[PDB]
């Protein structure tokens, strides 16, 4: 009797995440108040098995 | 965005965009082959046959 077993397992995984937050506020002496804030998020995941 | 002019004219403007995406691929391929071969007897004619 001869017997062979070959098992290969490969797992790959990537997670990326970006976060930008930009604020700008021009605050005069109770005459003009101009405030601007922008946000940006980006999450990616990628898992590959075999 | 916020904007206050003359401490009387107020304005706000808040937007938000959110996109989520998901993909999944799952493949399986199973192949089984069984092969049995029994050889029991070898039957021959006697050379003195008629």
UniProtKB/Swiss-Prot annotation, chain B:
Subcellular compartments: Cytoplasmic vesicle membrane
PTM notes: Proteolytically processed in two steps to generate the Macrophage-expressed gene 1 protein, processed form: cleaved by trypsin in proximity of the helical transmembrane domain releases the ectodomain into the lysosomal lumen to orient the pore-forming domain toward the endogenous membranes, and processed by the asparagine endopeptidase (LGMN). Proteolytic processing in antigen-containing vesicles is pH-dependent.
Induction text: By CSF1 in fetal liver macrophages. By interferon-alpha, by interferon-beta, by interferon-gamma and by bacterial infection with E.coli and M.smegmatis in embryonic fibroblasts.
Knocked-out gene: effects: Impaired immunity characterized by a failure to efficiently prime CD8(+) T-cells to cell-associated antigens. Defects are caused by impaired cross-presentation of cell-associated antigens. In normal conditions, mice do not show any obvious disease phenotype or a change in immune cell frequencies.
Segments passing through the bilayer: 11-16
Tissue specificity comment: Expressed constitutively in a variety of cell types including macrophages, microglia, neutrophils, T cells, marginal zone B cells, keratinocytes, splenocytes and intestinal epithelial cells.
Subunit relationships: Homooligomer; predominantly forms a homooligomeric arc-shaped pore complex instead of complete rings of 16 subunits.
Record-stated family: Belongs to the MPEG1 family.
Description of its domains: The MACPF domain includes the central machinery of pore formation: acidification causes a significant structural rearrangement, leading to oligomerization and deployment of the transmembrane beta-strands (named TMH1 and TMH2) that enter the membrane as amphipathic beta-hairpins. The P2 region contains beta-hairpins to interact with target membranes.
Function of the protein: Pore-forming protein involved in both innate and adaptive immunity. Plays a central role in antigen cross-presentation in dendritic cells by forming a pore in antigen-containing compartments, thereby promoting delivery of antigens for cross-presentation. Also involved in innate immune response following bacterial infection; shows antibacterial activity against a wide spectrum of Gram-positive, Gram-negative and acid-fast bacteria.
Name used for this protein in its record: Macrophage-expressed gene 1 protein
Taxonomic lineage from the root: Eukaryota, Metazoa, Chordata, Craniata, Vertebrata
Residues of the whole record sequence present: 117 to 166 of 713
């Amino acid at each position: 009797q001869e017997d062979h077993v070959r098992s290969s397992f490969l797992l790959d995984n990537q997670n990326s995440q970006n976060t930008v937050t930009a604020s700008a506020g021009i605050a005069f002496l109770n005459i003009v108040n101009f405030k601007v804030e922008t946000d940006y998020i980006s999450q990616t995941s990628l898992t590959k098995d075999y | 965005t916020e904007l206050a002019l003359f401490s009387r004219v107020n304005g706000k403007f808040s937007t938000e965009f959110q996109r989520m995406k998901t993909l999944q691929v799952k493949d399986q391929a199973v192949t089984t082959r069984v092969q049995v071969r029994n050889r029991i007897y070898t039957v021959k004619t006697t050379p003195t046959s008629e």
